[PDB]
Hints:
The first copy, chain A, is an all-alpha fold. Chain A is 90% helix and 0% strand.
Amino acid sequence: EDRAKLALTNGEENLAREALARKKSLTDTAAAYQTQLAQQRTMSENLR
Amino acid sequence: EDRAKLALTNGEENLAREALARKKSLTDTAAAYQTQLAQQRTMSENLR
Amino acid sequence: DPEKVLEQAVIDMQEDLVQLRQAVARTIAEEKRTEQRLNQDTQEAKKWEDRAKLALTNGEENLAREALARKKSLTDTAAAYQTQLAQQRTMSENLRRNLAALEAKISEAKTKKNMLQARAKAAKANAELQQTLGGLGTSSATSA
Amino acid sequence: FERMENKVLDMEATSQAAGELAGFGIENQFAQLEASSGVEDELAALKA
């Protein structure tokens, strides 16, 4: 998103929306990992 | 159904109704499996 | 015996989809081949018309009309190949539709047989519970 | 030169086979890329 702000500062809308795609991809991955974390904590208390 | 909403967003009614056909096909399969589940639970309590 | 047959039918379907993929690829070659011809052919008509323009520039009316005959011959061939192209595209969409349908048919035929087999096997397993319970202990142990 | 050009034309025939293969029904996969491109353009509208 910061790299996108560089394009906002001046220049490439193409870079800016490209950088949104990185931001989105990461965001989506973090939701998947947040889901994975719930499975870990539930399994942890199960073991406990 | 989400893939159908992409066509709603703009573009292909053909894709949209095609995606309804997937949704329908799945729905129908889930009713068959719901029926199968009743046979499992009944047989389970029979064994029990 | 059931499992043998049901799997065999599915096996056959895996051949079939590859065979029709070949036929599609073959058709792609027919379109490619005719494009290659028609594209050049239509230029050849121009080339000989250009050769005719050389006679227009000065000289031989005989060459000029001779060059028209080349142009005509090519033009006629290009109409024949344009006709051939219609047969290719029609046959292509025929294969495409046949395949798309066949793939759905195969897919569901396999899946239905599998889930049927699964539910049939599960059903006989439940029946085998009732049979083995019918294998009651109300037996010759009493006689002993 | 013709013999080896007959093989050039066979590669062109392989290109008819590549085009004859080329349609897949998966083209709809582009759509959210385009929508998200619009999203990064809305981030440009946010920038100004």
